[model samples]
Target: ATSWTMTAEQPDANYLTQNARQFADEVKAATAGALEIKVQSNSTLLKRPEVKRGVQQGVVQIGEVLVSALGNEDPLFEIDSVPFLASSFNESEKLWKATRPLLAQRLDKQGIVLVYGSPWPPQGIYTKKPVAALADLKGTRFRAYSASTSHMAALMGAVPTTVQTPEVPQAFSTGVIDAMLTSPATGVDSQAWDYVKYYYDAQAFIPQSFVIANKRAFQRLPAEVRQAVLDAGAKAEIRGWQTARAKTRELTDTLARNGMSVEPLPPQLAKELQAIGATMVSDWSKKAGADGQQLLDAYRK
Candidate 1:
């Protein structure tokens, strides 16, 4: 029997980690106990920034990371994160189709093998008070992360405040922030009901995460085991997409259950979101260069 360690950053109860555990379970069963993977989630093993390097160096045989988190290293890793470029599950899948090969080609160069990638639930807006129009955001202290998020906040006339994920609840408590553009998953994560009372289901953007394996570790697997991993990976990707869509409904209900008023994207807000999406998509293309343009063309087609 062979044992391997897989590292992830989401808490054990998160659907992301739960799905990771499910993938590992399928692999073990398919391999008939010849291989077992231990999952150390919640960053107990490696810091978020180190997961990529650690996997490259084989400190862990496998790991999961948000592809866009590495945008500084390469723009290809961040295309899906461009605001409103791919806002729904179907659109995200289309963008992923265009991105997968480039991602695989890049990871291959880094001594990592791409397993499969999946999108998180789309981002939405959370506010302490009800919001009804674009003007409602003016001068508001909006939560921000990453270039696109802060950029979106600024473009929408909100003050962009960079608050770390774990700090969101505290950020709200102390009046450091007045609004958030995030997902239902994080709404639950931060117990958002305690801090914010209104949510707009923007589906503004769909960011993604990829499961990656150390090149050597992947290559060393027995042929059948490797094939099983690939098969299970394909299954996981399909299953996860369906799960995320279903989960968005359930989690949104959870927010309402906790006393938050949940509403769909108001037409007035989406009018601005469309412009925000266009500006970010064009700007992202410039940074990503011709190759990036090609991928954008591929998806646009």
Candidate 2:
């Protein structure tokens, strides 16, 4: 028998953590107790950004991470959050299939393997004031969690500041950031209502979280157990996507119940944002070079 630990940044109740727990259970059942996975949620084992590295180094056999957080290593990781690129569940799934080969190949070279992943609810603008146009956001202090978001903020004439998820409440309360682009799940998780009153449901893009394993650890498992793990991972991927789509509305309602106004982006504003998205996509394609071009071509097909 073998035991493994899985690390996560979200609390036990967050959808990502919930999905991980379910994945663990399926792995256990499929392996017939040959493998037991202990999930340590809320950064109990490793910090959010550290999980990927930890798994690669074998500090943990498995871990979950927001794939876009690794954009510094590869621009392809940022593709999922490139504005209107994959705003809906269906589109996001297509993009994932198109890009998975490159992501997997890169990770495999680094001795890490992606077991499966799930998309977050689409991201949107959260602000204290209602935005009627792109101009309204000019000069605003915007929270930027990744390169794409920072570039998006700059393109919109806003100041981009780096802010981690755990520091969100304090950043908003102390006026370090006037607005942020994130999902309703994150808004509710961070109790964003205390500061942000308006959530522009722009459905800009849907980011994803990946459960990864150390290739060495996976290779060390018995043949039957390894196949069981793969089977379970496949099922978990489908289940995670279904869970994410189902919970999007529920999470958005949670935000509204907490006194935040969740509404679709104003039509004019949506059009302006779409234009910005186009520019961002062009910049990304240029930076990504041929590989990025191929991924996009496959997705567009």
Q: Pick the candidate with the highest lDDT.
A: 2
Which pairs clash in the backbone of model 1? none
lDDT of each: 0.85, 0.89
lDDT of 1 by residue, 141-258 (tens): 9998655677778988999998756567888889999999988998986678998999999998898877899988888989998888888889878887888988988889999999
Candidate 2 residue lDDT tens string, 1-301: 9999899878776888888899999999988899999999878788766888899888899998888888877899889988888899999999999988889988898998889988889998898988988888899999998777888889988999988777889998899999999988888788889988999898999998888899999999999998888888898889989988999999999999999988888998888889988998988888897999999999999
TM-scores of the candidates are 0.91, 0.95
